[PDB]
Amino acid sequence: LRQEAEQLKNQIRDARKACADATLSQITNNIDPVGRIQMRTRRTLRGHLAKIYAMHWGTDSRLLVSASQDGKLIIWDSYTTNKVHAIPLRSSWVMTCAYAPSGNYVACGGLDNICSIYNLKTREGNVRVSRELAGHTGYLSCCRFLDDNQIVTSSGDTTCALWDIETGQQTTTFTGHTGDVMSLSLAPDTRLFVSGACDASAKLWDVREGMCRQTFTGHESDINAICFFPNGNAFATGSDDATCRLFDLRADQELMTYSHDNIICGITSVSFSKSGRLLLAGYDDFNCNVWDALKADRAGVLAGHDNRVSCLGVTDDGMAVATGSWDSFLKIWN
Amino acid sequence: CTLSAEDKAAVERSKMIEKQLQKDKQVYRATHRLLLLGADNSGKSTIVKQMRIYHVVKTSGIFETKFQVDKVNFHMFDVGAQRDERRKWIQCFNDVTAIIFVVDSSDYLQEALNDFKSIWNNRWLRTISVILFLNKQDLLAEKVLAGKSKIEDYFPEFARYTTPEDAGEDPRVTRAKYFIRDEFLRISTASGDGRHYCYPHFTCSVDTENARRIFNDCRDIIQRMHLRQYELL
């Protein structure tokens, strides 16, 4: 069947070649870029103790949570540098973090395979864990809250799982990946999501149907972190192959290959600005790269850190970009 | 101050959060996290039983072993429920104090060689040094001295090797035990460059100095980490 299913996977590469009329770089040859823009660190968020594995923004655009691998989830007042909460975790190796759109909840997704959903807005002042989502048989590489009582979570098992915090059990288990799914990004319409994996394939998923809608290949290495383009019809994935790839939903191709030849380090984070014109990756050379997501130019470097940039996020209002790295510090850019 | 009243205590909470974090820093910086990378059929599952019982969930990926020896806390972190692809969960341990890569020297090992070769020349596990910690010597000498049917046809460089200068053991076992040591060091000192130095040992189920073999060779990393800050070493 391996030679029999190869032509059907070759049916995808020529159905995508049938739509391959003109590239995004050929389309956007007549649109003026953002140019070499200065972007400066506004708040250095000192206070962690270890490598900041992943941060996430509130949808309130101000509350920032970050996962550092010291056993500390810290919720930041990012506007005033204040630490809104610090959460002593049980899993000291937390790989990822997810702030709820409601803002009541936060997830640490440990290396220990629990998505400890912490309830921030308790009647108690303590941030107790509401549902340590045990399961998922692999390092919890990403998680993204859909609602207050529904989270989708990525695993080191080659399988993403949609959970229910009020129950405590994975309602859906998205099991299309052949390699460890390293990240996960929910759609703006929160009815799809995307998941980039160590199988070099980013798989589009339906959250309700549980089905692999499209599998986006084209990356040469393990897709380290992923984010949706904010109109929900595209996403850029960032692999270890140092080449970010903007794929298009309902098109099954890669549009822009954000490849600079002087960059060989892995793209360990990806975020999209509110326009989706300014895609700002978090590379492993201790700097970001605010790519023009249409012109595919470098268009801005965020060199604020000493160690590899593990996590970018642009706010829902698009105003800040927090940036955590493998030091104790989160730089907030503009 | 120009801060409001509920923002005056939003800092006074945040300062008391930092006061907890500067208390958690003393707990973090005075405790030495140790990755523990024994493979299948190795001795990892009993060394985390040995180091725990000497001194202090159904699919949990990390088992934390908190052992203190000479009154300094260590956290051995063997990696349980994660699958065989170590590519990405091993990056998370770039700021550990050591990597206790436990080896089945009894079995035949090239998988343990090619694992240690990848753990050494990894871009994130370079500048952190493996405590090589060769376990199961009671059955390693049984595979050479007592049994002798486990001869080294797997390893063609055994015929061109003899124990150079090394410490009641048989001379054919001590040649073998210091070849298993020498097989890793041919993949350790090749791409070490002084940033991280492998600290090998020999262990068993009845070792009982296994945690002291960590701490005395974990001192030898933090010493060598600080000597590299003085450009001394």
């Epitope: 509350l63 809104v84 | 006074e12 909470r13």
Partner: single-chain antibody
Framework: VQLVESGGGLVQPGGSRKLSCSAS????????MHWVRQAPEKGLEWVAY????????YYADTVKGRFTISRDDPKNTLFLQMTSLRSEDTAMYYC??????????????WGQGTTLTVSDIVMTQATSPGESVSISCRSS???????????LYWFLQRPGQSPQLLIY?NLASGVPDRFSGSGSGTAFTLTISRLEAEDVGVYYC?????????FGAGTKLE
């Protein structure tokens, strides 16, 4: 969450009794703790404050030296070591939970109160089922602060028990969505949409910029 009080009343004039707030059901070490008066012929006024820890302990100017406050965080209790209990130190003293961060709801849980008896912003308002009403509290100074929102806190109070936070124009989670708040820095109104048998009782508007906290007599709904 039970902020029950261990203190007592019937104090001599000039007496120096300590008033206890035994906190339970929450991370009391992570809470800014207050003390709020209620004279039997008047409304709420504020006494004291400790934040989380011991930094920024505040007081009203009427109790700046006579009343002192000190929390016992291992013993999980708050003390008000009052001294020289005189006239106008008679109040149903309400120990108040209040946590301060962005998006927080401070002043959101209240002690049952100790009926203690003896043998700046000067904001106030008017005194006053199924229909919409309004309250229209006015301030002394603008509260917009050019950094956040306006720091006015709506406290509905059922007549035979402790008060409770309504709006810290943000609705508290323990009170229903019929309540609403609006304002423009100086004039603030609490627009209940359909009042019921819980909404009957005195309302209160406390500022939170200048740390002397005043409430006003409030619309005693009947």
């Amino acid at each position: 969450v039970q902020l029950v009080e261990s203190g007592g009343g019937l104090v001599q004039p000039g007496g120096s009794r300590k008033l206890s707030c035994s906190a339970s059901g929450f991370a009391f070490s992570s809470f800014g703790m207050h003390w709020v008066r209620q004279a039997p012929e008047k409304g709420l006024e504020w006494v004291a404050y400790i934040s989380s820890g011991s930094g920024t302990i505040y007081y009203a100017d009427t109790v700046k030296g006579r009343f002192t406050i000190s929390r016992d965080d291992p013993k999980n209790t708050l003390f008000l070591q009052m001294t020289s209990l005189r006239s106008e130190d008679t109040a149903m003293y309400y120990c108040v939970r209040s946590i301060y961060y962005y998006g927080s709801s401070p002043f959101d849980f209240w002690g049952q109160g100790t009926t203690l008896t003896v043998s700046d912003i000067v904001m106030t308002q008017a005194t006053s089922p199924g229909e919409s009403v309004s309250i229209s509290c006015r301030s002394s100074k603008s509260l917009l602060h050019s950094n956040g929102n306006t720091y006015l806190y709506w406290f509905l109070q059922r007549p035979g028990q402790s008060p409770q936070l309504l709006i810290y124009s943000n609705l508290a989670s323990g009170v229903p969505d019929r309540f609403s708040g609006s304002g423009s820095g100086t004039a603030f109104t609490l627009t209940i949409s359909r009042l019921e048998a819980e909404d009957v009782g005195v309302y209160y508007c406390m500022q939170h910029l200048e740390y002397p906290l005043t409430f006003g007599a409030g619309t005693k709904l009947e």
